[PDB]
Each structure stands twice: as C-alpha cells, then as structure tokens.
Design a protein around this ligand. Structure first.
Ligand SMILES: CCCCCCCCCCCCCCCC(=O)OCCCOP(=O)(O)OCC[N+](C)(C)C
Ligand SMILES: CCCCCCCCCCCCCCCC(=O)OCCCOP(=O)(O)OCC[N+](C)(C)C
Ligand SMILES: CCCCCCCCCCCCCCCC(=O)OCCCOP(=O)(O)OCC[N+](C)(C)C
Ligand SMILES: Nc1ncnc2c1ncn2[C@@H]1O[C@H](COP(=O)(O)OP(=O)(O)O)[C@@H](O)[C@H]1O
Ligand SMILES: Nc1ncnc2c1ncn2[C@@H]1O[C@H](COP(=O)(O)OP(=O)(O)O)[C@@H](O)[C@H]1O
Lengths: 16, 674, 667, 20
C-alpha cells in the first residue's frame, strides 16, 4: 500500500 | 470484456507486451515496437519506472504500489500488472484481470494465457503491482495498420507471373481430371467388349495427356520458385535498408541476434503472400470442380467423401493447438540444455580445479532427460493425430468402396464409375486438405509479418531532426555545453548537470574517473544521442540544427573497442571514401605511424583482414583520413593548429598538460583544472 | 593408387585432413582427432611447422620449401601438400596429386577431388609444397576401428524392444497384404454375382482387419520413439561424460561450437542405428513377399513394376552428389551472409560515423543474391528430380493398367486380379523405395559416428597421468622450477629456461608485462599443462609423480577472469565439495568480507544471477582450504604460502616479498 | 637430397600460416 521509492522502483526488473 | 493477451515477439519485452495488452483492453491499439520505445526497453529488460512513465504518456494514471500476501484479495483496480519470477530465473511481467476466488488466467506474454490458480501464484509473486487507470488524455483508437495488407504489394510489379501460374494450375487440373477417367473407359467399354484396337489408341492419348500435365507442373514449379525468391529478396532488402537508416536508440536497445532474426521472418511473409494466395485461389476452383464431378458420378459417395473430409478437418483443427504448445516447450528445454552445455564447456577450468565433473554430468543428464520428456510428449501428440487421421481415411475409403459396390449391385451406378470416382477423389480431397492446412502457415506468417513490419514504422534518424542549414562552413569554433543531461534510455541518469567550454585549443579533459562515462558525452557531442534538458553549442547555433551529413563528416573518434570490417585494408582504412586514391591512404598511414604495419602484411595494402590479428592504429589512420575539425581520442600528428583534440584517458597521468583539463566524477564538472 | 580425399569434420581441420589423406595414401590409416593433436591444430588453424612435426612423428621424412612459379614443371613428389588462398580471403591446405598440362588434380578437404587448370591453379597457390617421403621406419597398419559397430553395441541392452517392433511390423504387413484383396473380392466375386449379404459380411471383416492394422501401427510407433530416445540419450551422455574428462589441451585447442555441435551427430547415429537397421530388417522381407505375390498374380506386370522401381532407383542414385554439393554451397553462402550481417550490425557506430549506410547496403545486397543463386540451383535439381520421378511413376502406372487390360482381354488374368495387383503395388514399391532412400542417412550417420568416435577414442587426463607415490603430505615449501620451457601447442614458446625457488610461507610475487605469461606459470603449477622439458618440484617428489586430486584440492587459484555458474550461490560458492556445507561458507563469507556483498539481494535464495565478482571467486577458494593460493589483482590465511599474487603494472605492490620479472631476469 | 632449392628454416617456417 506504499509507493516504491525511485531507487527501489527501478530495482523492479522485468523480462530476463 | 474480452481478456486480450498480447504475446511477446522477442525475449525481453514483457513490460511492453503487458502495456499493449492493457491498452488494447481499454481500447487503444499500437505497434509493440513504439510501445517498447516509449518504455525504454533495454537489452537487459524493463523496469517498473519505464512502465509508469510510458503509461502516463498514453494517458493512464499509473502507480507503483507494494502489496502483501493478503493484499491480493482486495477491491483494487481489477486489471493490473503483476511481477512474477519463473522457475530459477529473473522476474517477469503478467496481467491479473479479475481474481475471482482464484488468481484469474494471467495474460502471460511468454506462453499464451495460463490460469495460475491461487495456490502457487503468490509463491512466485512479489509485491510488485502497477495500478493503471484511464485518464483525461486517453483517446481510444487504432494506431497500427493491417500490415499483411501493406505486404503483398510486391506482387504488383511481377503480377504477370501470378496470372501465368494460375493459368498453368487451371490447365494442370483440367488435364488431370481428363486423365482420371482412364479406368471408366477401361472397365466399361475397353474390357467388357474386348476392343483391342481402341485400347492402344486410348492408352496413348491418356499417356500424352499425362505428359502434358507433367510439363505444366514443371513450368508452374519454376514460376512459383522464382516468385518466392523475388519476394524474399525484396522484403529482406527493404527491412535491412530501413534498419540501417534507423537511429542508435534502436540499435543499442536490442541484441545482434534479436535484430538479425527478423531476416528469417521474411520467408514466412513470403509464404503467406505467394503460397497461401496461390493455394486458396487455385484449390477453391479445383475443389468446386471436383465436388461437382463427384456429385455427377454419385450423390451418396460424394456425401461420404464430404463427411470424410469434414472429419479430417475437425481432427486437424482440434489437434492444432496442443501441437503448437508442445513445440514451444521443447524449444525452451533445448535452449536451457544448450545454455548449460555452453556454460559448462566455457568454464572447464573452474570445473577441473574443483573436481566437479560428476555434478555437471548429473545436471546435464537431468537437462537431457527433461528435453527427451518434452520431445516424447510432442511425438505422442503427433502419433495420436496420425492414428486418428489414418483410421478416418481408411474407414472412409472402405465405406466408399462398400457403398459403391452396393450401388453397382442395385444398378444405380456403373462398374467403372466406382473406380472413376476413386480416381477423382484425389481432386476433391487434396484441395480441401491443402486449404485446411493453411492455418499454421497463415497464423505464423501473420505473427512474422507483424514482427518484421513493426520496425518499418519506426522513424529513422533523418526525419527526427528539426530545421537545419544556415551554417554551411564546417564547424571549427568554440564548443559549449549548456547544463545538458542524458539518461541513456530510462535507466538512472549518469549525465547530471554539466557546463563546460572548450575554446579551440588542443588538450581538454583527460580523465574524470575509471568508469564515469567519458565516452558517452563524446558520443553525445557527435550527435549519436540527443541530450535532454539542455543544448550543445559549438557556436553553430544549436548543433541539433545542423545536418548529420556534416556533423558525422567533420568529427572523429578512436576508442579501445575499435571495430575492423572483414575486407582489404585499403577499403577498411578508407571506409566510405569514393574519392580517395592510394596515395592519400599511404599519406594517412604515414602520419599515423602505421605504414610499417601495413607493409608487414604479405599482400601489404591488398591484404585481406580477418577481423583479428596494431589494430588500434588503424582507426587512427581512418580518423586522420577523414580530415576532421574535431578529432576525439580515447586511450591509445598531421593536424592543423585550429583542430580540437579530446584525448580522453583512464589514468591520472597528465601526459602533456597542454591546456585546460576537466573531470566530471559523478555529477557536475566542479573542477577548473586550467 | 586411388586419390584419397578426407573430409574435414570441423572448420579448421585442413592440415589434419590433408595429412590424414597422405597417410592413407601410403597405407597408414589413423583417427583424425589423434592427428590434430600431433599437428598442434588450434582455433586459428595449423601451420607448416605443425605438419612437418606430425609427419616426422608419423615416420614421414618431411621438408618445407618456398617453391617458385617456374619449378612446378618437374617431379618434386606426387602426393605433395600445397597452401592455397581460397577465394581471396582465407588460407587453406590442399593435396596436389598429379601435375599435368593445364590440369591439376587437387584433393581439397572442403570440396573434394577437383580439377584445376595449371594456369588457373597458379592464381591461388601462394607457395606451399610441403614435401613428404617414406622414412626408414614407416610401419603401415589400420590404426582406427569401425564405429558403427561400436554405436550399434548400444542395441544389446534393448533386445526385447527391437523384437517387438519386428513382430508388430510383420503382422502389420501381413494384415495389409490380406486386406489389399478387398477390391479383387469386390469386383470379381460379389458385384458380378450380386451377393448383398456377403458384401456386408466381407466389408465388415475387412474393416475389422484394417482397424487391427492401425492398432498395431499405434503400438509399434511408440516403441520406435522410445528406442530412438534411449539410444540418443545414451550416446549424448557417454560423449559428454568422456569429454568432461579430457585434458585441457582438448578444450583450448577447439572452439566451444566444435564441441557442442557433436551433440547433433548423436541424432544421426541413432537414426541410422535404429531406423536404418529396422527398415533393413522389415522392408527386405516385406518386398520379397510383395514381389512373390506380384509374380503370382501376373509375371508381365511384375516385370513392368520391377522396371519401374529400377528406373526410380537409378534416377534417385544419379542425383545424389549434385544435391549434396548444392546444399553445401547454400550452407556456405548462408554462413557468409550471416557473418556479414553480424559484422554490419555490431559495427553500426563506425558505419554511421563514416556514412557507409549505402555502401554496406549495396554490399549486403550483393551477398543475398549469391545465396539466391545456389538456392535456385537446389530448386532446379529438386524440380528435375521430381519431374523425372513423376514421369516414371505415372507412365509406369499407365503402362501397368494398359497391360493388365490387355491381359484381361486374353484368357489369362482378370479385372479383379488387376485391381488386386494395383492394391499390392504399394507393398512392393514402397519397401524398395525406402531401401534406396536409406543411402543419405547411412552416409551422414557414418560421418557422424566417425566424428563422435574420434573424440571418444581420445585418452583422458587420468590415462596420461604418471604413477603416484606416497606424497600425501600437503604441497608446501620451495616450489622449484628446473629449466622449464612451455609451448601452447606448436606455436612460439611462452616459457624458456626459468628457475626460481618460491620460499616456503612467503608473500612472493611475480611482475611483468602482458606478454610475460605469468598465468602460464600459474596454470603449469596446477598441472593444467605439462612442461615441455623439465619438471616442477615442491620439496621433493616432483609434481609429475603425485595424484591429481591433491593437486586440484590444494592449489586453488583466483584471477581477474571470474566465471559465475548459473545456479545457487551456496552451490556456486561451495562448488564440487558435495560434503558438509551451509555453515563453513559463512565463515568464508566473513573471512573475505563477502557476507556484506551477498546480504543485499532481496530474495535470500539461490540467486540464479543469469550467469566486482572477484570476491565470489575468492570465497569459493576459501572452502578448499588450500596450502597454495594465487591471485591476479585481488587475505590472512596461515603460515602456508597462500599468496603468489600476479602483478602487471609497477608499484601495485612495492614491498611484500621478493619480486620476479619476466623470464626471471632478476629476483 | 634437397633437389629443389632454397631450403627453409624453423625461424622462417614459423611465420608460414595455413590456418582457417
Ligand atoms: C476447368 C476444368 C474442366 C475439366 C473437365 C474435364 C472433363 C473431361 C471428361 C471426359 C470424359 C467424359 C466421360 C464421362 C462420362 C460420365 O461420367 O457420365 C456422363 C453421362 C453419360 O452417360 P454414361 O457415362 O455413358 O453412363 C451410362 C449411360 N447409359 C449409356 C447407360 C445411357
Ligand atoms: C519413361 C518411364 C516409363 C516407365 C514404364 C516402364 C515400363 C516398360 C515396359 C514396356 C514393355 C511392355 C511389354 C508388355 C507385354 C505384355 O504385357 O504382354 C502381355 C502378355 C500377353 O501376351 P502372350 O500371351 O504372352 O503372347 C503374345 C505374344 N504375341 C502373340 C504377341 C507374339
Ligand atoms: C508419348 C507416348 C507415351 C507412351 C508411354 C508408353 C511407355 C512404353 C510402353 C510401350 C507400350 C507397351 C505397353 C502396352 C502393352 C500391350 O498392350 O501390348 C501391346 C502389344 C500386343 O499387341 P497385339 O497382341 O498384337 O494386339 C493386336 C490386336 N489387334 C490389333 C490384332 C486387334
Ligand atoms: N551498453 C550500455 N548499456 C547501458 N548503459 C551503458 C552502456 N554503455 C554505457 N552505459 C552507461 O555509461 C556509464 C559508464 O560509462 P563508461 O562506459 O564507463 O565510460 P568510460 O569508458 O568513458 O568511462 C554507466 O553508468 C552506464 O550506465
Ligand atoms: N587460449 C590460448 N591458446 C593458445 N595460447 C594462449 C592462449 N591463451 C594465452 N596463450 C599464450 O599466452 C601468451 C599471453 O600470456 P598472457 O595471459 O597475456 O600473460 P599475462 O598473464 O602476463 O597476461 C601468448 O603468447 C599466447 O601464446
């Protein structure tokens, strides 16, 4: 329920 | 609404596919290439920040929200993006739609649309959720054209070959149908009445008919092969030219194999354009004529044959999807096995040092066993389909013979008419079978056409520019940087505010740090990438207002990773010259102190170069031969006084200390160094 | 007397292939993989020195000469080997067999036996002529073994799956042959006499027969698949398990592709071990029975069918070589086009900087056209073959119907017998067609079986190991080199007469430039390669007389080139131990300070990582508990000598212990 | 034994390349 920080949000990797 | 699921065209565009699926669900269709350009899909994958940025571009009010295990059962936005991790791999993006007491079938772009009930989804699902929502800027529309219609325009130039093939097919079908009635004359008049004289004449006539039919088939095959070759070459060259005209953002966001694999997509489109169209428009008439003739011979046998072909079509259509699913899984297992094999062979030193031969052998055995299991599943599906088709065909033939014999006994049909119908069966079963067999070709080729053509819609480097001209003399003046920033995609910024000024001279910043990005702003100066929130000034009035035909012409660059093309050194050293003789190349090598190395080769200036063999000096000679006003050097004379040299290095040596030195480290220059 | 030509199994076997051809010419046949290790073939190919050395070792008196353009008009030697520049880009080795006016016979491993005009040959011959003569001790003999038997020996474990397939095929053939007389009964006994009830009875019986035939086809097709998978898995596993034991010369003397591609040959070997043998056993008897029945029906129609199948066989085995050559040329052109595309895409920055978009586009356009030419060549060959086969088949069918009707007019034979013969024609033509079509499978799988057997016949690392001794004591103290010189094959030596002491339990380091080859010393320490002349001593009991396990367990070495295996970090950090773990690594995490680095991934799991990082390699070597340890640029430990750190640039470590320069110039 | 002329040497035989 909390927005991810900019440093953490980019850490959310996607495909491969 | 329908649960639309956009499937991946490459291996690293899960986020783009998911965003396209959401947009299509909300009523907005776009090319996937443009979508992944908006998300900044790099060759490593896509981050959630890129999806958030791209969704807001389309009008969606995106938001990245962390969720817990019990947060799945909540009354939030029903269509959402969920981050999942496949077995022992990296992350992956999927779509959650309804979550009705089970995790609803997720639009997994990798493999169709899988269910993933609420028993194991939360085991592979982290708190990565994107809460998209339509907004004011949303504007429903279809922004992609039907690209199969865009193709087949290569048939228009050589449209006389299609007509000739159609006429040859019609004549071939007519001759085959005429020759199919051999037995009816054989078993009704030529045998029942013992006509020995007419037997030879009729046999010779049918032999001549068959020979003409064979010649027609030969000619048609030649024409079809030539048409397919021409379409292949045209599509391949068009795609390659448009790729070569594309900017560098396209090139650095994809792998070499990813870009080249679209060449294999030019054969599927060729298939759907030539073969599918020819088969449809020939076999439709062929089947119509065959059905008319079969109904003329006998209605009941024609109905039996129609039932047979309907059953075969039903079986094939039912078995189509599992075959594709099984053939997809075997490719994944084979890829995993070959990746394990290559990583084991490359790292033989570590395995030998630690004595891990047995462990690697067991792992490879497990991989091979999994591959064999998948292959056996695919083979079992093939066996089941073949057995069903075989029973259908055999029972149909036996029932046809049985009913024909019954009709002949009842007197409703002649004895030779049964064999005439049997021979004519090949002209009503084969056409419909070929028409039914076009589903895999059409589907795969539509996928390939979209994959290959979504690149062709991308804007190239030339038309992305603003106005130009008003500065014709080659740029040689003072260089200025105006608080320029660069992101290098959608990753973290690495070009925070920089302001600097190079007033001609000969020496500028040598080192900023061991990996701070000294090459990236050198490329940005060469206008490979457009800076954001700032302008580059070489007092040519906003260089972004200067033609690339001059910017790339009067700027040089030599680095560590110098690429040498396979060819003679004369052409490689003077790539794209068209006005340079041997003397100019010799002089350029002389001022580059590389003429001795060139003469060292056996054939000297005519020696072929195998991309390996100093190679660093070759780029120096090429850059000097370019005769630039700005000559950028990375770590590694014949130059005018008013020529700027950059001499970027990685060691704090201060070789010459000729002029002012800059350095950026992490953020601003904040270092005079004059 | 026959001009022996040996196909090259890889892309760089040219010298090995020509030397094997020469050896076979004089009556000495050897395995190719045992030749391209005496020749010292590398990833870049073999030189003339390697060929001379291998010929001398084989007993051939070998010599080199830079022959001029006017001395070819004589008799140097008949089987001489020459160096030619194929096209204008690559070098190659060929065998020049006969020298005649305006015609020269050339055995080229890539192509085959070819004829080159003397003036035409002079345009590519850049001074080869390696001269070979039979030496005083040249003992002939066939030193290779048949490999198809070796891989057929994999069928002995499965002798109740081949027998079941054979019986199922026999009963399937019998059922089909019995059911092919339905048309004869239909048009000779039932339609003529108007027997309605017998019609239904016989139709139901033949439907049951066909259903049984298909059921036997469903059960037999599963067993064939299972046999194929079993043979394939056995062959691949055996090959891989043997490769993982070969010495390090094998791995660095070949590309990774040259090793991986041998897996695809197991499929060919299985195809001609399971499929070919089963087809030979089944279709031979099937064709014999079918021909017997065809002759029982009518002799003339059987003779016509035999003529048809003979013509089909001749036509198939006359288009055999051209199709293979066309396919090979297409593969070569496709490889060239793909390489050009890879180079163009990779070097996009140079093309865009220098404005070569239109030039490279035109160059690639001229390469697609060359692929299309050979593709149309194979299309022409296939279309000619199909047209000839269709002509033969259709004319034969028409002639069969004509002669059958003519016989029916006469007293002999009947229309029902004619339809029965037409039905039976599929049980005599198809078996011979398959027996004729088996040839490409047999040839390709013979090549594949040779390819795999060459590697499988190579002696492993432990096989060449000398006898061990009672030096179970851990290696520690005064690592001695005595006149050690090393070579990386048959290339320029990297080491030459180096002697140094390496005092026990010290911080000794070795310093030099890139070309000095300190990693060569490190690899020689770990017995990865053996010194060409000399020995390595560690306080007595020289390194060549102790077990390999003690070598690999005590000389842990970490360099800049770190390789992370895709898997669990616990298994990656503790690799190959297969013993107590999950605790000691923790201390190794603390000792090397690797615990902090690994305690940041937000999963606390295997951390697959999808394949800086030197710290992970450092922690990997800690678990080994080594008495000798080497670093490149990356401590503590104990009294044992665990630092042989490499140094490239000066002053990276100025005062740790004695410093050795390149070639051991000073201590 | 030579009978051809211009016998070579290892120092010169090394640079002769017959590779790929
Ligand atoms: C564009 C493609 C067009 C292709 C069309 C080619 C057709 C050529 C076929 C020529 C052979 C025609 C013979 C077929 C005869 C037949 O199939 O039916 C016709 C009806 C005549 O009747 P009949 O065959 O003699 O039967 C017994 C009747 N009767 C004698 C007892 C009264
Ligand atoms: C281009 C591809 C074509 C492929 C086709 C190959 C087939 C070629 C075979 C031709 C030979 C045809 C000869 C057939 C002879 C025949 O089928 O004949 C039946 C026997 C009945 O005749 P018989 O009772 O033995 O006595 C009669 C003798 N005599 C009174 C005429 C002298
Ligand atoms: C463009 C041409 C294509 C033709 C393809 C034919 C391939 C070569 C085969 C040759 C024909 C042989 C097959 C026919 C077999 C046959 O049918 O045999 C004929 C000889 C018997 O002739 P005969 O018994 O003397 O009949 C006399 C009757 N009468 C005239 C007295 C009433
Ligand atoms: N291929 C690439 N993909 C993603 N980022 C890159 C790539 N090449 C360079 N960068 C960016 O450039 C920065 C490092 O620049 P670097 O290559 O070290 O320049 P230099 O070699 O002049 O020091 C990194 O922060 C990285 O984000
Ligand atoms: N894979 C290889 N195959 C053959 N020779 C090699 C290989 N790798 C290195 N060499 C040899 O090692 C020498 C280079 O040593 P290098 O590793 O650069 O030393 P250092 O450890 O000081 O950098 C070269 O002369 C080359 O002949």
């Amino acid at each position: 329920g909390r927005e991810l920080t900019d440093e953490e949000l980019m850490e959310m990797t996607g495909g491969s | 609404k329908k649960y639309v699921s956009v499937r991946q065209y490459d291996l690293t565009d899960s986020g783009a596919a998911v965003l396209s699926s959401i947009a299509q669900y909300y009523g907005l269709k776009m090319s996937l290439a443009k979508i992944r350009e908006m998300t900044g899909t790099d060759t490593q994958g896509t981050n959630a920040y890129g999806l958030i940025h791209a969704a807001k571009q389309l009008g969606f009010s995106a938001k990245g929200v962390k969720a817990s295990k019990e947060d799945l059962l909540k009354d939030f936005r029903l269509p959402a993006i969920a981050n999942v991790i496949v077995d022992n791999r990296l992350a992956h993006f999927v779509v959650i739609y309804s979550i009705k007491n089970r995790i609803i079938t997720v639009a997994d772009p990798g493999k169709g649309i899988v269910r993933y009930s609420m028993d194991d989804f939360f085991s592979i699902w982290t708190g990565g959720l994107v809460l998209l929502e339509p907004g004011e800027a949303f504007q429903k529309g279809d922004y992609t054209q039907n690209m199969m219609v865009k193709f087949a325009g290569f048939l228009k130039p050589l449209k006389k070959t299609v007509l000739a093939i159609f006429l040859a097919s019609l004549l071939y079908t007519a001759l085959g149908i005429a020759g199919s009635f051999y037995i009816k004359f054989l078993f009704d008049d030529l045998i029942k009445f013992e006509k020995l004289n007419d037997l030879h004449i009729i046999s010779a006539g049918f032999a001549v008919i068959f020979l003409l039919q064979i010649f027609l088939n030969y000619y048609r095959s030649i024409l079809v092969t030539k048409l397919g070759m021409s379409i292949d070459k045209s599509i391949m060259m068009e795609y390659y030219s448009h790729v070569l005209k594309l900017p560098m953002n396209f090139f650095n966001s994809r792998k070499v194999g990813e870009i080249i694999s679209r060449f294999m997509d030019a054969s599927k489109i060729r298939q759907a354009i030539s073969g599918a169209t020819l088969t449809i428009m020939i076999d439709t008439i062929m089947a119509v004529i065959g059905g008319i003739l079969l109904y003329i011979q006998n209605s009941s046998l024609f109905f039996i044959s129609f039932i047979i072909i309907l059953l075969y079509g039903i079986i094939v259509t039912v078995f189509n999807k599992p075959i594709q699913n099984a053939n997809r899984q075997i490719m994944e297992d084979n890829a995993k096995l070959t990746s394990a094999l290559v990583e084991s062979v490359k790292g033989i030193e570590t395995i030998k040092s630690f004595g891990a031969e047995e462990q690697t052998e067991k792992s490879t055995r497990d991989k091979i066993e999994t591959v064999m299991k998948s292959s056996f599943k695919e083979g079992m599906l093939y066996i089941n389909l073949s057995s069903l088709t075989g029973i259908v065909a055999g029972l149909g033939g036996i029932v046809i013979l049985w009913a024909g014999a019954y009709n002949v006994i009842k007197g409703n049909m002649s004895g030779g008419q049964l064999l005439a119908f049997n021979a004519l069966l090949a002209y009503f079963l084969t056409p419909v079978k070929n028409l039914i067999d076009l589903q895999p070709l059409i589907q795969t080729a539509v996928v390939a056409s979209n994959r290959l053509g979504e690149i062709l819609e991308l804007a190239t480097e030339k038309e992305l520019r603003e106005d130009s001209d008003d500065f014709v003399i080659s740029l040689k003046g003072d260089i200025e940087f105006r608080n320029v920033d660069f992101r290098y995609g959608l990753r973290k910024p690495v070009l925070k505010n920089i302001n600097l000024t190079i007033p001609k001279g000969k020496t500028v910043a040598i080192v900023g740090e061991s990996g701070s990005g000294k090459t990236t702003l050198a490329k940005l100066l060469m206008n490979f990438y457009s800076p954001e929130k700032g302008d580059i000034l070489i007092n040519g009035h906003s260089i972004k207002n200067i033609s690339l035909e001059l910017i790339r012409k009067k700027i040089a660059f030599v680095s560590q990773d110098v690429f040498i093309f396979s060819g003679t050194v004369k052409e490689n050293l003077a790539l794209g010259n068209e006005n340079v003789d041997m003397d100019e190349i010799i002089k350029a090598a002389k001022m580059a102190n590389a003429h001795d190395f060139i003469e060292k080769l056996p054939l000297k200036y005519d020696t072929f170069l195998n991309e390996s063999g100093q190679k660093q000096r070759l780029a120096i000679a090429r850059a000097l031969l370019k005769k630039p006003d700005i000559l950028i050097l990375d770590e590694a004379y014949g130059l005018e006084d008013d020529v700027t040299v950059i001499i970027i290095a990685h060691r704090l040596s201060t070789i010459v200390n000729a002029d002012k030195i800059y350095l950026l480290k992490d953020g601003e220059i904040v270092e005079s160094g004059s």
